[PDB]
């Protein structure tokens, strides 16, 4: 209170990083806590130290409880009725004040409170800088090496932490080393907000490769997508906007130095450069690299497609574990598949045979005529009216009667939907035991009808693993329904 408290509070390098009001409030709160510790009564007071004056005025708050205990710090309107009840019960406004506290025997407590306030100020600065800036997503030097954890200190008092899953499963970090991780969550932990990073997304790899790619730096080629996974897959691909540029060369960088640099940040996984194309059919093959151009598939409107490749390269192109398939799903904007050319040929033959069999029974034409009409192209005798007439009637001969397969189908759609709809009418018809059970979707009745279950006893006998075989309904929902049915059967004494 002699033009010294404000000067002591204002460092202003680190202590006065925030406004002087915050530091004064923290110091006054510490002083009030020390005074309350020194005070015989367990009263609650708050102090305010003006920056201009420095005299910390302390006012004892009320915080009125709904009980009669501790009248100096908890009262109600019933007791205030003697004083005409000027204020309602439960008021937390200030109602008392203290002249001055000596704070002499409590010097150790004041020092402990000052240390706690310094820690709180460090945490506040961390929240003000790293949390407001979403941490420091940059390469740094680790300072603490805990069990499967690395804590690094950044500039401006910022800090970051690396989770166990965010690092390599086999590699362990040590203090003073380098850890690569993009901070995305500054959790407000005690004594500073340590940023949390996770190396499980392709964004970090794309950002690392973009800076070291001359095409990306000069904006000659723009990257449409990127795929990366720790331990599973990591590919770099950029698309040239008709600038006559090599996608593999742009993604690799200068003699592969960019890939080698990104490999360390990617958890030790090798970084490979793949091509990119605008056409999805070409884009799938481009993103399948390192491989050969043997997967070709197109779709009308859906994004689903098939992938065909040689037997030797069947694991390199996609792989049964997806070791490159996640690239084709991501770096191409199209569906991927892990199989050989034989599997695709068998699938196409099966689809053609199914279409021919359906058309034979749906058009009432002769078997040989239907086979001859359907062998010209895949799915020829299907959606004749919806598809253009140039495809369903390209061949000559019975061009006029080709529209009959759609004209009859338009009228017979009602009978066609009968097999889809009334199939459950006789075979396990729905009942209130399972179809009307609360907590399930509309597909539950169809699943019960197609599984042969009709009564709730069969569902109650089964558990969750047995019902988990159906992908439509999860094990938890079926288990909950079975438990509810069993409870109803047990306790149906009360309506």
């Amino acid at each position: 209170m002699n033009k010294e408290i404000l000067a002591v509070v204002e460092a202003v390098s680190n202590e006065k990083a925030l406004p002087r009001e915050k530091i004064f409030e923290a110091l006054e709160s510490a002083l009030a806590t020390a005074t309350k510790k020194k005070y015989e009564q367990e009263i609650d007071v708050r102090v305010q130290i003006d920056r201009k004056s420095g005299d910390f005025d302390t006012f004892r708050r009320w915080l009125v409880v709904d009980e009669v205990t501790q009248p100096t710090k908890e009262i109600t309107l019933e007791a205030a009725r003697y004083e005409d009840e000027s204020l309602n019960l439960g008021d937390y406004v200030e109602d008392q004040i203290e002249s001055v506290t000596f704070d002499r025997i409590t010097t150790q407590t004041a020092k402990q409170v000052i240390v706690q306030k310094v820690r709180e100020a460090e945490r506040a600065m961390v929240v003000d800088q790293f949390r407001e800036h979403e941490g420091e997503i940059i390469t740094g030097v680790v300072k603490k090496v805990n069990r499967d954890n690395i804590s690094l200190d950044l500039g401006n008092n910022a800090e970051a932490v690396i989770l166990r899953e965010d690092m390599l499963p086999r590699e362990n970090f040590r203090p003073g080393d380098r850890v690569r991780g993009v901070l995305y969550s500054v959790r407000p932990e005690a004594r500073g907000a340590q940023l949390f990073v996770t190396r499980s997304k392709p964004e970090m790899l794309i950002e690392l490769f973009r800076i070291e790619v001359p095409e990306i730096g000069e904006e000659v080629i723009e990257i449409k997508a990127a795929a990366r996974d720790p331990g599973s897959r990591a590919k770099i691909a950029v698309k040239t906007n008709d600038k006559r540029i090599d996608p593999v060369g742009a993604c690799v960088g200068m003699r592969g130095a960019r890939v080698q640099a990104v490999s360390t940040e990617l958890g030790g996984e090798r970084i490979d450069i793949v091509l990119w194309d605008d056409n999805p059919a070409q884009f799938v093959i481009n993103a399948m690299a390192p491989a050969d151009v043997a997967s070709i598939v197109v779709d009308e409107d859906k994004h689903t497609m098939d992938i065909a490749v040689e037997a030797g390269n069947l694991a390199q192109a996609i792989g049964r574990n997806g070791q490159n398939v996640r690239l084709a799903s991501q770096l191409s904007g199209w569906e991927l598949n892990v199989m050989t050319v034989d599997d695709l040929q068998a699938k196409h033959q099966a689809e053609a045979h199914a279409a021919i069999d359906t058309f034979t029974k749906y058009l009432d034409i002769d078997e040989d005529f239907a086979t001859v009409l359907v062998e010209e192209g895949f799915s020829t005798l299907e959606e004749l009216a919806y598809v253009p007439m140039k495809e369903l009637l390209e061949i000559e001969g019975l061009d006029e009667p080709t529209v009959e397969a759609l004209r009859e189908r338009a009228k017979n759609a009602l009978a066609t939907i009968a097999q889809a709809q009334e199939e459950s009418l006789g075979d396990n018809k729905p009942a209130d035991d399972l179809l009307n059970l609360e907590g399930v979707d509309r597909d539950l009745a169809f699943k019960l009808a197609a599984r042969g279950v009709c009564t709730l006893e069969d569902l109650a006998e089964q558990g969750i693993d047995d019902l988990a075989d159906i992908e439509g309904l999860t094990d938890e929902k079926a288990g909950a329904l079975i438990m509810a049915a069993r409870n109803i059967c047990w306790f149906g004494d009360e309506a």
Partner: protein
């Protein structure tokens, strides 16, 4: 340290650091304080108990 300006400068407690050197009872023995003597040279102002 800035903690010094925070603690002793603001509060006015400019002693400012203290170390425990109290004449503790030697371990292993109980007792009852029967007589206490205070000898003060006549240069220092004696406290209330003196």
């Amino acid at each position: 340290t800035p903690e010094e300006k925070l603690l002793r400068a603001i509060f006015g407690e400019k002693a400012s650091d203290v170390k425990d050197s109290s004449l503790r009872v030697p371990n292993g023995v109980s007792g009852t304080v029967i007589d206490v003597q205070v000898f003060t040279r006549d240069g220092v102002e004696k406290d209330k108990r003196a």
